[PDB]
RNA sequence: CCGGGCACUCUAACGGGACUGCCCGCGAAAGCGGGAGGAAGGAGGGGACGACGUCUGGUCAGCAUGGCCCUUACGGCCUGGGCGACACACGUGCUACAAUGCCCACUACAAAGCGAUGCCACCCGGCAACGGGGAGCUAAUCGCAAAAAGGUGGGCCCAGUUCGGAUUGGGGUCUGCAACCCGACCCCAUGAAGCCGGAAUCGCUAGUAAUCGCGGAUCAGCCAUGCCGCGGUGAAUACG
């Protein structure tokens, strides 16, 4: 019963977490509050400008974020509203079982 | 080097010219690109000219310098020395 | 000795494994 | 003259103390004190006559040593310089063979600097 | 030698080994990002403008 | 030459991306690659239209494409028509479910990338430069902004010394991370070479 | 020793003596000219002669330009010359009070 | 029945769990001087109890999680002097003069660009 | 520096003895940050001039620190065309340090083959004054007695 | 580890929090000296951020671009070679010259990252590199994994050595169409210089310097001792 919320911009990350765990805690019944998995990074150093100048750097990040809510007990007036919620663009889901 | 697992590496290309000398009786010299190629216990006693960039160099083979590759024996630099 | 490959400090500081430092 | 030509240093220990032969490494001294079943703890100057001629016996037998092995890698350099390959020709000048860089440093090799 | 090259980079090869990548933006061949398709300073261009997602200035 | 992109600067603080969607590192290169096509027509296409952004959303093999500009109407074609064979072409690159929509600038005068391509394009049609920016930066201000700030360099007037040109009113912190500061920038072709003019307008502090 | 770089450029073994020959000038002074470094190159309106040198007392760098090669070489030399007698005698300018 | 306090110092993290008793002590599922065995900078960590004349009233269990030997040493010496506080709050007095109640946030500084390693300048020569 | 004066750094008590003096005297056996090591030979020395010596670790090195304390130095000063060593009086602050530096160093100097042994005896020579460390001590003394003809030139 | 529980460690989002706010003293004032409270105190440590401008600074070889130049060639494809040359000279670094050390073994404590023809537990073969088997993991699960210095015990005994690991012979493993030029690794043998470095000259003011290992980007493999990060242990000294 897993729903797991992945993406690069965290205010979406608890936007999603927040209007799915309020779905299933109405429709029926238990769910396991959202929790926070650590974040995996992906750093991008670089040499500023195009030509030699090796020791003036640019550090960029990529944060792809990582969230997990349980549905506990699932109660199927819920498992249809599911396959019908409004997901922002910048995330990723995942539901198995 | 090479692993001795697999095989002992000549360019199939060459081979085959080495082996049509000895049926037909050998021996001419034999213009290859091919440095990379074992020398190998057929190729003993023609002499194959190998490129290293700019000259053919001739190569009579010897029975003592078969398992050496063949741009081994076709230097590729130029040095007399200094000043 | 972390340049001499046949010690075991040798090949912490390669990085590589053998009869000196076994895995 | 103890093992085998040379007389391997007395107050070391066995094991030590072959590695004082040409040819003879960590390696290869731990395996005759093994193969002759002797203490390398033992210090040379500790050895029967007994322990000596069965360490000496065994090592001069079953590897090839000091001026015999040298021989071989003169006969091979001998022989790569003479064929004329690669290697053979940086061993005819004196220069590195394992494809070092030689802009700078080879001074092994090379001895120490020459002037210009 | 670069259109040419920017081109048989693209080419699928007579033998694997000659796989090499090339920044699909600016066709450099130094310094390119598996994760992009970017080389080194046009990964900081288009990250200057926003065009690559999730990724931010880092500073710790 | 030393100073930061401002854009980059104030991602995540007073601005958003261009592109939004999530990806895995063997989707990410690939959809990024379609994006600057996407962007390589309609920047192309759309000049005439008085292009401001290109937004980009995605989920799978269906994208929302938000375009924001200064005149809608070169963007619909006849009710519908040009809007269109964008899409046909469009996906025919995206090879895929191209949703192609068309967002208003409330004031071209009020948005950086445009006010730059107005006068590089007042400068390919040999303006006098000095003259061409006072004005631009005049116009910017009486459309309200709290601070603006435009830039030449190159061959200026055809000089061969390449010169450096620049005004500003009120205020254009660009060490201030609360400050609004949009920034556009436009390559003016000419004759004589290549002049970049840049733009920076200050809306507010937020 | 002494190091000389031409920069785009294409100089004999001549020219390059040449260097040496005028630098001497600065044995001079008797003392210590170390890692002495010059650079040769071809401006659009004349050449260039940099040099940057320390002795036990500082840095000598200095550069010259002129039409002539010969005579940049020169013009780097007078300024040599002078930072390098400046360096000399600076320190007796005040022995009192 | 028990006694805790968070204790941390570096990337050494300890949770102290302080029991009354003769004054054994355990940290991470064995005897203390067996983990901490030749390490004189030990005998720190049970410190801030010695302050305080707490030797003999105490048991102490204790897991510790990262950071070295000494941080945790470190943590530990932080955890123990948490707990006296809620076992007894006039504490502080003959705690905080001591500089036992104070968490010390010196943390391994960042490697810069363009540098060896966190303030390490590479080596140059002018001329 | 350039602003205002520096804030010497309080030490943390050693745990065999409580005292800030055998610290510093640690650190500066320390090389390379291995501490530990540090004590080991330090406290290794003290039960080697426990046995050889029937009294205190602590108060034979509290000696051999006093003895080393170089009360006068000389600081050079140029004036005029000379460089003068001018006579100067040692701030305690430095006079430790002078001291635990060189009774490193002197014993550092010695033929013993143990780290542990080396201090253990530099210590003790120094408390009976012999050794390097005490040797550097008057040497640095001698030198600024000689020179005292130059002590209005003090700063 | 299972029931069980989120206390705690943590993880990761949102807040609080320091403000010279209070106290005495000095001061016209801004502030300065100081005490208490407090995790933290006078910018808390670090970071991101670089004014008008200067060097006619750097890059037409990342890209863009005026102009000039080439058009069976100054365009293009390939095989091989070169970029890896070596009387010399300079810059950056690695590893050392040893006992505060070296080797064998037994035994501990990190963090940041990375991983579907990818990381590979475990089993087997081989002294080993590695080979053959083969479970898990779209990864806070599974794996790379061992952190190393450290700790306990044992050897070495001041020797160009049980220091140092360069050079060279021989024998293998792997990637790769292919390792002569020219890869890396393993193992036997070899076992150089080097005994702390003239003139001169670099870094760093605290979790810094020094020392220690671990990851990553690039990448088939790799000449990485380079670079960007991460933690471990952890000083000296600042009159001026
Ligand atoms: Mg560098
Ligand atoms: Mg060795
Ligand atoms: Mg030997
Ligand atoms: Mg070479
Ligand atoms: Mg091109
Ligand atoms: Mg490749
Ligand atoms: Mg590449
Ligand atoms: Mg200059
Ligand atoms: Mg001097
Ligand atoms: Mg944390
Ligand atoms: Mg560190
Ligand atoms: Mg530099
Ligand atoms: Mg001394
Ligand atoms: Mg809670
Ligand atoms: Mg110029
Ligand atoms: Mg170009
Ligand atoms: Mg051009
Ligand atoms: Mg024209
Ligand atoms: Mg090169
Ligand atoms: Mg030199
Ligand atoms: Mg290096
Ligand atoms: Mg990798
Ligand atoms: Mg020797
Ligand atoms: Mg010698
Ligand atoms: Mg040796
Ligand atoms: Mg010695
Ligand atoms: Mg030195
Ligand atoms: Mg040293
Ligand atoms: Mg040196
Ligand atoms: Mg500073
Ligand atoms: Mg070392
Ligand atoms: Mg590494
Ligand atoms: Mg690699
Ligand atoms: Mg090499
Ligand atoms: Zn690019």
């Given at each position: 019963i897993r729903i797991k919320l992945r993406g690069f911009d965290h205010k979406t990350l608890d936007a999603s977490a927040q209007k799915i765990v309020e779905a299933a805690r109405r429709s029926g019944a238990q769910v396991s509050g959202p929790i926070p998995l650590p974040t995996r990074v992906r750093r991008f150093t670089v040499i500023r400008g195009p030509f030699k100048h090796k020791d003036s750097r640019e550090h960029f990040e990529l944060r792809t974020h990582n969230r997990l809510v349980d549905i506990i007990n699932p109660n199927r007036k819920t498992i249809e509203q599911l396959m019908t919620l409004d997901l922002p663009t910048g995330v990723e889901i995942e539901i198995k079982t | 080097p090479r692993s001795l697992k697999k095989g002992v590496f000549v360019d199939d290309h060459l081979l085959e010219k080495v082996l049509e000398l000895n049926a037909k009786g050998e021996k001419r010299l034999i213009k290859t690109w091919s440095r990379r190629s074992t020398i190998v216990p057929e190729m003993v006693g023609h002499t194959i000219a190998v490129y290293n960039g700019k000259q053919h160099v001739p190569v009579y083979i010897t029975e003592n310098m078969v398992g050496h590759k063949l741009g081994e024996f076709a230097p590729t630099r130029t040095y007399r020395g200094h000043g | 000795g972390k340049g001499d490959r046949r010690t075991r400090r040798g090949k912490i500081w390669r990085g590589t494994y053998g009869k000196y430092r076994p895995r | 003259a103890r093992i085998a030509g040379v007389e391997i240093p007395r107050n070391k220990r066995v094991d030590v103390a072959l590695t004082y032969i040409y040819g003879i490494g960590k390696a290869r001294a731990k395996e005759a004190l093994e193969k002759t079943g002797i203490n390398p703890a033992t210090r040379v100057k500790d050895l029967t006559e007994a322990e000596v001629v069965r360490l000496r016996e065994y090592v001069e037998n079953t590897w090839k040593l000091?001026?015999?092995?040298?021989?071989?890698?003169?006969?091979?350099?001998?022989?790569?310089?003479?064929?004329?390959?690669?290697?053979?020709?940086?061993?005819?000048?004196?220069?590195?063979?394992?494809?070092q860089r030689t802009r700078t440093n080879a001074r092994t090799r090379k001895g120490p600097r020459k002037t210009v | 030698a670069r259109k040419a090259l920017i081109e048989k980079a693209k080419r699928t090869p007579k033998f694997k080994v000659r796989a090499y990548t090339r920044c699909v933006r600016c066709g450099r061949a130094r310094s390119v990002?598996?994760?992009?398709?970017?080389?080194?300073?046009?990964?900081?261009?288009?990250?200057?403008?926003?065009?690559?997602?999730?990724?931010?200035?880092?500073?710790? | 030459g030393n100073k930061i992109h401002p854009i980059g600067f104030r991602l995540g603080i007073t601005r958003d991306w261009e592109s939004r969607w999530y990806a895995g590192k063997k989707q990410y290169r690939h959809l990024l690659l379609e994006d600057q096509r996407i962007r390589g027509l309609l920047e192309k296409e759309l000049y005439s239209a008085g292009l401001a952004?290109?937004?980009?959303?995605?989920?799978?093999?269906?994208?929302?494409?938000?375009?924001?500009?200064?005149?809608?109407?070169v963007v619909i074609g006849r009710g519908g028509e040009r809007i269109r064979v964008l899409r046909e072409e469009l996906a025919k690159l995206t090879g895929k479910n191209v949703a192609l929509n068309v967002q208003e600038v409330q004031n071209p005068n009020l948005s950086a990338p445009l006010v730059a391509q107005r006068v590089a394009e007042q400068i390919e049609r040999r303006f006098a430069v000095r003259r061409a920016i006072k004005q631009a930066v005049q116009r910017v201000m009486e459309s309200g902004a709290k601070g603006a700030k435009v830039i030449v360099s190159g061959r200026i007037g055809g000089a061969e010394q390449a010169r450096t040109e620049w005004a500003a009113q009120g205020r254009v912190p660009l060490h201030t991370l609360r400050a609004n500061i949009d920034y556009g920038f436009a390559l003016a072709r000419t004759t004589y070479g290549v002049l970049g003019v840049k733009a920076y307008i200050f809306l507010g502090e937020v | 020793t002494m190091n000389i770089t031409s920069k785009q450029m294409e100089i004999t073994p001549a020219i390059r003596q040449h260097v040496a020959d005028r630098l001497a000038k600065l044995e001079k002074w008797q003392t210590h000219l170390i890692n002495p470094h010059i650079i040769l190159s071809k401006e659009p309106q004349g050449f260039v002669a940099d040099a940057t040198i320390n002795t036990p007392?500082?840095?000598?760098?200095?550069?010259?330009?002129?039409?002539?090669?010969?005579?940049?070489?020169?013009?780097?030399?007078?300024?040599?010359?002078?930072?390098?007698?400046?360096?000399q005698h600076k320190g007796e300018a005040r022995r009192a009070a | 029945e028990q006694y805790y306090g968070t204790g941390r110092r570096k990337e050494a993290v300890a949770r102290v769990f302080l029991r009354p008793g003769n004054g054994k002590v355990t940290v991470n599922g064995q005897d203390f001087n067996e983990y901490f065995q030749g390490l004189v900078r030990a005998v720190a960590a049970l410190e801030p109890l010695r302050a305080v004349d707490a030797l003999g009233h105490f048991d102490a269990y204790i897991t510790v999680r990262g950071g070295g030997k000494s941080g945790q040493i470190d943590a530990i010496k932080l955890g123990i002097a948490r707990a006296?506080?809620?076992?007894?709050?006039?504490?502080?007095?003959?705690?905080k003069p001591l500089g036992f109640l104070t968490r010390d946030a010196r943390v391994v500084e960042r490697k810069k660009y363009g540098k060896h390693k966190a303030r390490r300048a590479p080596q140059y020569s002018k001329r | 520096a350039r602003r205002r004066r520096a804030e010497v750094r309080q030490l943390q008590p050693d745990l065999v003895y409580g005292d800030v003096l055998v610290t510093a005297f640690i650190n500066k056996i320390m090389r390379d940050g291995k501490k530990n090591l540090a004590a080991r030979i330090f406290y290794d020395?003290?039960?080697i001039i426990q046995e050889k010596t029937g009294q205190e670790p602590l108060k034979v090195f509290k000696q051999a620190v006093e003895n080393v304390k170089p009360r006068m130095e000389v600081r050079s000063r140029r004036v005029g065309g000379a460089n003068y060593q001018?006579?100067?009086?040692?701030?305690?602050?430095?006079?430790?340090?002078?001291?635990?530096?060189?009774?490193?160093?002197?014993?550092?100097?010695?033929?013993?083959?143990?780290?542990?042994?080396?201090?253990?005896?530099?210590?003790?020579?120094?408390?009976?004054?012999?050794?390097?460390?005490?040797?550097?001590?008057?040497?640095?003394?001698?030198?600024?007695?000689?020179?005292?003809?130059?002590?209005?030139?003090?700063?």
């Amino acid at each position: 019963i897993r729903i797991k919320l992945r993406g690069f911009d965290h205010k979406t990350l608890d936007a999603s977490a927040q209007k799915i765990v309020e779905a299933a805690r109405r429709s029926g019944a238990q769910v396991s509050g959202p929790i926070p998995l650590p974040t995996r990074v992906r750093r991008f150093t670089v040499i500023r400008g195009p030509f030699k100048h090796k020791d003036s750097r640019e550090h960029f990040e990529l944060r792809t974020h990582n969230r997990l809510v349980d549905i506990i007990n699932p109660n199927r007036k819920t498992i249809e509203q599911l396959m019908t919620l409004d997901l922002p663009t910048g995330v990723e889901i995942e539901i198995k079982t | 080097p090479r692993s001795l697992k697999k095989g002992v590496f000549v360019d199939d290309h060459l081979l085959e010219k080495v082996l049509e000398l000895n049926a037909k009786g050998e021996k001419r010299l034999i213009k290859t690109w091919s440095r990379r190629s074992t020398i190998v216990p057929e190729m003993v006693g023609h002499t194959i000219a190998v490129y290293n960039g700019k000259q053919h160099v001739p190569v009579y083979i010897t029975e003592n310098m078969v398992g050496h590759k063949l741009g081994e024996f076709a230097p590729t630099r130029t040095y007399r020395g200094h000043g | 000795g972390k340049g001499d490959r046949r010690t075991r400090r040798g090949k912490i500081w390669r990085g590589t494994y053998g009869k000196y430092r076994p895995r | 003259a103890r093992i085998a030509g040379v007389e391997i240093p007395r107050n070391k220990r066995v094991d030590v103390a072959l590695t004082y032969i040409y040819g003879i490494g960590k390696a290869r001294a731990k395996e005759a004190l093994e193969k002759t079943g002797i203490n390398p703890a033992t210090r040379v100057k500790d050895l029967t006559e007994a322990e000596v001629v069965r360490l000496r016996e065994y090592v001069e037998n079953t590897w090839k040593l000091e001026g015999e092995l040298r021989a071989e890698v003169a006969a091979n350099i001998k022989r790569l310089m003479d064929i004329g390959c690669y290697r053979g020709l940086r061993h005819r000048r004196g220069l590195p063979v394992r494809g070092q860089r030689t802009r700078t440093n080879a001074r092994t090799r090379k001895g120490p600097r020459k002037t210009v | 030698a670069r259109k040419a090259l920017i081109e048989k980079a693209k080419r699928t090869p007579k033998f694997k080994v000659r796989a090499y990548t090339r920044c699909v933006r600016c066709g450099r061949a130094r310094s390119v990002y598996r994760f992009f398709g970017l080389c080194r300073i046009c990964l900081r261009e288009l990250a200057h403008k926003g065009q690559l997602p999730g990724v931010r200035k880092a500073s710790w | 030459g030393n100073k930061i992109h401002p854009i980059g600067f104030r991602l995540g603080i007073t601005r958003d991306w261009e592109s939004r969607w999530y990806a895995g590192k063997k989707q990410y290169r690939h959809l990024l690659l379609e994006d600057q096509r996407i962007r390589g027509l309609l920047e192309k296409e759309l000049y005439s239209a008085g292009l401001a952004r290109v937004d980009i959303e995605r989920a799978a093999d269906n994208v929302a494409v938000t375009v924001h500009v200064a005149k809608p109407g070169v963007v619909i074609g006849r009710g519908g028509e040009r809007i269109r064979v964008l899409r046909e072409e469009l996906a025919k690159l995206t090879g895929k479910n191209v949703a192609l929509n068309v967002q208003e600038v409330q004031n071209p005068n009020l948005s950086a990338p445009l006010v730059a391509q107005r006068v590089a394009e007042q400068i390919e049609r040999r303006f006098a430069v000095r003259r061409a920016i006072k004005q631009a930066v005049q116009r910017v201000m009486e459309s309200g902004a709290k601070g603006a700030k435009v830039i030449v360099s190159g061959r200026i007037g055809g000089a061969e010394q390449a010169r450096t040109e620049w005004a500003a009113q009120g205020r254009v912190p660009l060490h201030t991370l609360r400050a609004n500061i949009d920034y556009g920038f436009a390559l003016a072709r000419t004759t004589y070479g290549v002049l970049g003019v840049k733009a920076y307008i200050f809306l507010g502090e937020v | 020793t002494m190091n000389i770089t031409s920069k785009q450029m294409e100089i004999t073994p001549a020219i390059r003596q040449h260097v040496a020959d005028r630098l001497a000038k600065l044995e001079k002074w008797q003392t210590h000219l170390i890692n002495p470094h010059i650079i040769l190159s071809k401006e659009p309106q004349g050449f260039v002669a940099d040099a940057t040198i320390n002795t036990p007392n500082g840095v000598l760098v200095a550069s010259g330009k002129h039409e002539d090669m010969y005579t940049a070489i020169n013009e780097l030399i007078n300024k040599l010359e002078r930072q390098l007698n400046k360096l000399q005698h600076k320190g007796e300018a005040r022995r009192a009070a | 029945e028990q006694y805790y306090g968070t204790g941390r110092r570096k990337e050494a993290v300890a949770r102290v769990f302080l029991r009354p008793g003769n004054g054994k002590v355990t940290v991470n599922g064995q005897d203390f001087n067996e983990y901490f065995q030749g390490l004189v900078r030990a005998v720190a960590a049970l410190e801030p109890l010695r302050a305080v004349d707490a030797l003999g009233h105490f048991d102490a269990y204790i897991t510790v999680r990262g950071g070295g030997k000494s941080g945790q040493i470190d943590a530990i010496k932080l955890g123990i002097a948490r707990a006296l506080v809620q076992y007894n709050p006039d504490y502080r007095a003959k705690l905080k003069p001591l500089g036992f109640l104070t968490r010390d946030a010196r943390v391994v500084e960042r490697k810069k660009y363009g540098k060896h390693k966190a303030r390490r300048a590479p080596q140059y020569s002018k001329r | 520096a350039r602003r205002r004066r520096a804030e010497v750094r309080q030490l943390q008590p050693d745990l065999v003895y409580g005292d800030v003096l055998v610290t510093a005297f640690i650190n500066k056996i320390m090389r390379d940050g291995k501490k530990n090591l540090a004590a080991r030979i330090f406290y290794d020395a003290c039960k080697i001039i426990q046995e050889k010596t029937g009294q205190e670790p602590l108060k034979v090195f509290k000696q051999a620190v006093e003895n080393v304390k170089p009360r006068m130095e000389v600081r050079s000063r140029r004036v005029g065309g000379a460089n003068y060593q001018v006579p100067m009086e040692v701030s305690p602050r430095r006079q430790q340090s002078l001291a635990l530096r060189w009774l490193v160093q002197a014993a550092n100097q010695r033929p013993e083959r143990r780290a542990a042994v080396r201090i253990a005896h530099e210590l003790m020579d120094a408390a009976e004054g012999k050794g390097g460390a005490v040797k550097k001590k008057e040497d640095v003394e001698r030198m600024a007695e000689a020179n005292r003809a130059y002590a209005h030139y003090r700063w």
